[PDB]
């Protein structure tokens, strides 16, 4: 119910919401239909527009005007933003030279630099260049402040998931806004762009920035802006709030523009109609900067210019229809568009079978423009599985396309020429970041980074302790002049054992069908003499309680888990000059590790589905003496034959190719167990599948971290400076149904699979409980940046 009898006189855009009886005058009142009857008249004034003119300079204040050009307007904080330019001969901010902001230059009473988050919907990364001639204000922010060439959104690359990720530092699976449309089966409730259900606070998880702020005594302005409040009024409202007294004035503000996204949907990302929305947003930026300059805050405030996602060319004709694949199409519910989510139309349908749906959608047409996945099989970098709001069956849609259930959906609903939502590594989905202000660096370019990292930085900018989140706090220290966050490396929880030779060969029953110059040399390789070569960045630290052994070898070093019966990690360096050799069913006991903590070949013989591979690649053995170490039982891991095709091509072909290209590489490989798809290391008791008749757990994924010298004129093993990394988390699957070309030679499809399953080191850390890069010559923040890097394989 609504009770509207009171007045907004002197209360327009008041910050503290009032409850009934009082009617409302805050920015959300319109959305809750609770505004005082005189809200429009008093709070949404438009008379005489938004600009002072010479003829208004010095006017008698008329309270009906949208903004003021009277002598008192500065002290009231309600001048039109161009007042000082038109009436006091000042220059527009954009026409002033950039001058370094070394320290905050704030009015008396300011306890910290305010932060203004200027968010632009659908602002594609390449607009910064392509639109440069029509966006002088934005171009000034970008060139004078700190900017990235692009910022990576989260998947799906939709608005509410991205904006809420910016606010929380969380992946969508964790904050709960997993799409623009959702069904929660626990609550039996549907979230839609249109309607009331989205206002229910149960949808919105984590702790968004305005709550983190409030809880720590830092006041916040609105983040949500009602669509009908024109941009000019939003800006003036922010500027009025910044004129408030010390104990009422917010320290954090947000502005949101629905452009260029609104036009981008109609016209496509580079339609000729797009130039005017870009000019208009730039003008709004210049209003804000001029307004701040009037208030003497343009060298006080930190401004973040940020987008939620990009925009791709998508038309009605490029729609895939499930009715062309499914005979049972009326038995499913599809969440459609630039991603697909399928569930049963009725939970009382006992014929509904996901496996049959997935099979009917798999590689059925040669140019098929989507791929079906069970959500646990999506690339782990998407972090898109661990929420009951995410349907088990997912369709990853190719850029430029849509999926829909039936054609009648796409003509009873061409209109649009642009859309977004695709895989967050797609170039068209990239968006923008610029930071301008005293706390940001001056004329500095930083590498691309992920939007999950910004919450921590905004907390650093405001002196807040961030809520637990998915950023890696310190990885964006390089954006900041001051207020850097300086963490310590996590403490190692489990110390390694260093077993020597403790077992005789006859103590083992594996079922595997099998000179003092080179005797002290093999002893010393088992005691760790080449370890400097193969373990370039220190041993990984184990951040959980467990029992493991460090095993040294001529060609590789491993941390062998006595609990999972295989390595957690295997580390080796392949020089540019290394040779690849030919290679059978010999697996040898490791006399350092007990039979009881080893695998055996019999289990593999009995398990007709499961085979085995090796973590250190026998192909890359340095000498035929070293080659025996590659066939130790402690280097064996369980592998489906289907996956062995992938792994062998990586090991036999790709590692050497990378060493050639990168001037040596250091590789760390290992298993991952994530049966509950939460992106976190499984405990022993979460493992769902073992090699038949054994306690050998089956990994869900295999990782590798491939490190070399950023200056590739230096070899990986003698690198003086910054490092370069690429990594992957490959799904350990019993088929290659993912790869529609897999009947062909591995050179036509394996590398494509690996690229899709590219990963950050930090993803692997979450999944393994390991901490890498413990002993480098690099600063710890530089290393945290390195650990967040993702090799995306998209051109510039």
Ligand X SMILES: *[C@@H]1O[C@H](CO)[C@@H](O[C@@H]2O[C@H](CO)[C@@H](O[C@@H]3O[C@H](CO[C@H]4O[C@H](CO)[C@@H](O)[C@H](O[C@H]5O[C@H](CO)[C@@H](O)[C@H](O)[C@@H]5O[C@H]5O[C@H](CO)[C@@H](O)[C@H](O)[C@@H]5O)[C@@H]4O)[C@@H](O)[C@H](O[C@H]4O[C@H](CO)[C@@H](O)[C@H](O)[C@@H]4O[C@H]4O[C@H](CO)[C@@H](O)[C@H](O)[C@@H]4O)[C@@H]3O)[C@H](O)[C@H]2NC(C)=O)[C@H](O)[C@H]1NC(C)=O
> Quick one: which of 724, 736, 758, 788 contacts Na ion (CB under 5 A)?
736
Return phi, psi of residue 325, to 5°: -120, -40
Q: Which does 736 bind (CB under 5 to 8 A by kind): Ca ion, ligand X, Na ion, none?
A: Na ion
Closer to ligand XUO by CB, 12 or 633: give it: 12
Q: Is 676 annotated as a binding residue?
A: yes
CA-wise closest residue to 175 among 209, 198, 205: 205
CA-wise closest residue to 157 among 374, 381, 311, 271: 311
CA-wise closest residue to 340 among 309, 375, 312: 375
Structure tokens at 301: 């405030």
DSSP 330: G
Residue 597 CB, shortest distance to Na ion, in Å, is 37
Contact pattern for Zn ion over residues 235 through 264, marking x by CB under 5 A: --------------------------x---
CA-wise closest residue to 424 among 165, 164, 155: 155
Q: Is 180 annotated as a binding residue?
A: yes
User: Could you say which residues in the range 447-486 bind ligand X, by CB under 6 A?
Assistant: 468-470
Concerning whether 362 is annotated as a catalytic residue, the answer is: no
Distance of CA 347 to the CA centre of its chain: 33
| 428 is a contact residue toward ligand X (CB under 6 A) | no
In the set 81, 146, 159, 554, the catalytic residue is 159
Q: Is 408 annotated as a binding residue?
A: no
- The SS3 of residue 212 is helix
CA-wise closest residue to 399 among 449, 350, 338, 327: 338
Q: Is 509 annotated as a binding residue?
A: no
- Number of Cβ within 10 Å of residue 543's Cβ equals 17
Q: Is 159 annotated as a binding residue?
A: yes
Closer to ligand XUO by CB, 308 or 771: give it: 308
Closer to Ca ion by CB, 27 or 119: give it: 119
Closer to Ca ion by CB, 232 or 261: give it: 261
Contact pattern for ligand XUO over residues 15 through 54, marking x by CB under 6 A: x------------x--x-----------------------
| 26 is a contact residue toward Zn ion (CB under 5 A) | no
| 411 is a contact residue toward ligand XUO (CB under 6 A) | no
**How many residues of this chain interact with ligand XUO, rule: CB under 6 A?**
30
Return phi, psi of residue 119, to 5°: -100, 135
> Quick one: which of 167, 565, 603, 659 contacts ligand XUO (CB under 6 A)?
167
Angle of helix 136-144 relative to helix 275-294, nearest 10 degrees? Answer: 60
| Tokens 């019966």 belong to residue | 565
Q: Which residues have C-beta within 8 Å of that of residue 314, sequence separation ≥ 6?
A: 338, 400, 401, 402, 416, 417, 418, 419
CA distance 312 to 61: 48
Stretch that binds ligand XUO, among 218-226, 330-338, 506-514, 659-667 (CB under 6 A): 218-226
Structure tokens at 638: 């369980």
| 180 is a contact residue toward Cl ion (CB under 5 A) | yes
Q: Kind and range of the H or E element at 419?
A: strand 418-419
Closer to Ca ion by CB, 371 or 375: give it: 375
Q: Give all strands (DSSP E) within 121-192, no chain letters.
A: 146-147, 151-152, 182-184, 189-191
Return phi, psi of residue 271, to 5°: -55, 150
Q: Is 420 annotated as a binding residue?
A: yes
> Quick one: which of 27, 137, 174, 428 contacts ligand X (CB under 6 A)?
174
Closer to Na ion by CB, 663 or 742: give it: 742
Structure tokens at 444: 């500095």
Burial of 652-674, coded b for 16+ CB within 10 Å and e otherwise, reads bbbbbebbeebbbbbbbbbbbbb
Closer to K ion by CB, 243 or 694: give it: 694
CA-wise closest residue to 556 among 476, 477, 627: 627
User: Could you say which residues in the range 182-211 bind ligand XUO, by CB under 6 A?
Assistant: 193, 198-199, 201, 204, 208, 210
Q: Which does 315 bind (CB under 5 to 8 A by kind): Cl ion, Zn ion, ligand X, none?
A: none
| Tokens 């030919």 belong to residue | 582
| 312 is a contact residue toward Zn ion (CB under 5 A) | no
CA distance 278 to 266: 15
Closer to ligand X by CB, 44 or 211: give it: 211
Residue 470 CB, shortest distance to ligand XUO, in Å, is 15
- The SS3 of residue 402 is strand
Residue 322 CB, shortest distance to Na ion, in Å, is 21
Structure tokens at 339: 């991603």
Footprint on this chain of ligand XUO (rule: CB under 6 A): 15, 28, 31, 117, 119, 121, 159, 163-164, 166-167, 180, 193, 198-199, 201, 204, 208, 210, 220-225, 227, 254, 256, 258, 261
Footprint on this chain of ligand X (rule: CB under 6 A): 170-171, 173-176, 205-206, 383, 386-387, 468-470, 678-680, 766
Provide the annotated binding site for 1-tetradecanoyl-sn-glycerol 3-phosphate: 159, 180, 261, 420
Active site residues: 159
Provide the annotated binding site for 1-hexadecanoyl-sn-glycero-3-phosphate: 159, 180, 261, 420
Provide the annotated binding site: 121, 159, 180, 261, 265, 308-309, 420, 674, 676, 678, 680, 682
């Amino acid at each position: 119910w609504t009770a509207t009898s009171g007045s907004c006189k002197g209360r327009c855009f008041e910050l503290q919401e009032v409850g009934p009886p009082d009617c409302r005058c805050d920015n959300l009142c319109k959305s809750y239909s609770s505004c005082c009857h005189d809200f429009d008249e008093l709070c949404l004034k438009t008379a005489r527009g938004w600009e002072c003119t010479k003829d208004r300079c010095g006017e008698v204040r008329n309270e009906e005007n949208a903004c003021h050009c009277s002598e008192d307007c500065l002290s009231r904080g309600d001048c039109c933003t161009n007042y000082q330019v038109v009436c006091k001969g000042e220059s527009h901010w954009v026409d002033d030279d950039c001058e370094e902001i070394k320290v905050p230059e704030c009015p008396a009473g300011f306890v910290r630099p305010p932060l203004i988050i200027f968010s632009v919907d659908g602002f594609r990364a390449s607009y910064m260049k392509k639109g440069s001639k029509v966006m002088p204000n934005i171009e000034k922010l970008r060139s004078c402040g700190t900017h990235a060439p692009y910022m990576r959104p989260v998947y799906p690359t939709k608005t509410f998931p991205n904006l809420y990720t910016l606010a929380t530092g969380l992946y969508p699976e964790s904050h709960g806004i997993v799409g623009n449309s959702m069904y929660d089966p626990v609550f039996d409730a549907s979230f839609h762009l249109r309607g009331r259900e989205k206002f229910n606070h149960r949808w919105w998880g984590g702790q968004p920035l305005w709550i983190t702020a409030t809880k720590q005594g830092v006041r916040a302005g609105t983040f949500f802006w009602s669509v009908s409040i024109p941009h000019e009024r939003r800006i003036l409202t922010i500027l009025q709030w910044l004129s408030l007294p010390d104990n009422e004035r917010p320290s954090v503000y947000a502005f949101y523009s629905e452009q260029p996204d609104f036009s981008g949907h109609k016209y496509g990302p580079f339609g000729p109609e797009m130039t005017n929305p870009l000019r208009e947003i730039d003008k709004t930026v210049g209003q804000l900067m001029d307004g701040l300059k009037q208030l003497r805050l343009h060298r006080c405030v930190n401004v973040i210019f940020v987008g939620d996602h990009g925009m791709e060319d998508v038309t009605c004709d490029r729609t895939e229809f499930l009715s062309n694949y499914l005979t049972n199409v009326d038995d499913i519910t599809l969440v459609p568009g630039t991603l697909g989510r399928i569930r049963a139309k009725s939970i009382n349908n006992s014929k509904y079978d996901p496996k049959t749906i997935i099979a009917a959608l798999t590689c059925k047409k040669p140019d098929q423009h989507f791929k079906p996945y069970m959500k646990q099989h999506l690339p782990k970098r998407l972090h898109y599985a661990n929420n009951r709001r995410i349907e088990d069956i997912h369709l990853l849609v190719d850029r430029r396309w849509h999926v829909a259930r039936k054609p009648l959906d796409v003509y009873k609903k061409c209109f649009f020429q642009g859309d977004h939502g695709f895989d967050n590594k797609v170039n068209s989905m990239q968006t923008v970041f610029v930071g301008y202000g005293p706390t940001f660096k001056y004329r500095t370019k930083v590498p691309p980074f992920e939007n999950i990292e910004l919450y921590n930085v905004m907390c650093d900018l405001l002196g807040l302790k961030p809520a637990p989140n998915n950023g890696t706090h310190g990885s964006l220290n390089h954006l900041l002049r001051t207020n850097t966050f300086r963490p310590t490396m996590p403490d190692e929880v489990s110390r390694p054992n260093y077993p020597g030779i403790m077992y005789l060969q006859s103590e083992f029953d594996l079922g595997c069908t099998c000179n003092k110059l080179e005797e002290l040399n093999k002893r010393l390789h088992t005691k760790g003499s080449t370890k400097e070569r193969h373990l370039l960045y220190g041993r990984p630290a184990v951040l959980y309680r467990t029992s493991y052994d460090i095993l040294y070898h001529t060609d590789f070093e491993s941390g062998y888990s006595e609990i999972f019966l295989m390595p957690l990690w295997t580390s080796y360096t392949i020089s540019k000059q290394a040779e690849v050799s030919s290679i059978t069913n010999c697996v040898r006991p490791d006399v350092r590790v007990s039979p009881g903590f080893s695998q055996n070949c019999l289990a593999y013989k009995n398990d007709k589905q499961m085979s085995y591979g090796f973590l250190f690649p026998p192909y890359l053995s340095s000498s035929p003496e070293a080659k025996y170490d590659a066939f130790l039982v402690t280097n064996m891991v369980p592998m489906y034959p289907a996956f062995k095709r992938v792994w062998a091509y990586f090991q036999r072909v790709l590692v050497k190719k990378y060493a050639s290209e990168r001037n040596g590489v250091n590789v760390i490989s290992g298993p991952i167990f994530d049966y509950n798809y939460d992106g976190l290391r499984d405990t022993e008791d979460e493992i769902k599948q073992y090699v038949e008749g054994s306690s050998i757990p089956v990994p869900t994924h295999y990782y590798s971290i491939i490190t070399s010298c950023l200056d590739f004129t230096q070899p990986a093993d003698k690198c003086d400076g910054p490092l370069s990394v690429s990594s992957f988390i490959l799904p350990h699957r019993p088929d290659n149904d993912e790869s529609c070309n897999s009947s062909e030679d591995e050179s036509k499809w394996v590398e494509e699979l690996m690229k899709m399953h590219t990963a950050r080191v930090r993803d692997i850390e979450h999944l393994t409980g390991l901490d890498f890069y413990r002993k480098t010559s690099r600063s710890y923040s530089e290393i945290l940046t390195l650990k967040t890097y993702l090799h995306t394989y998209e051109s510039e």
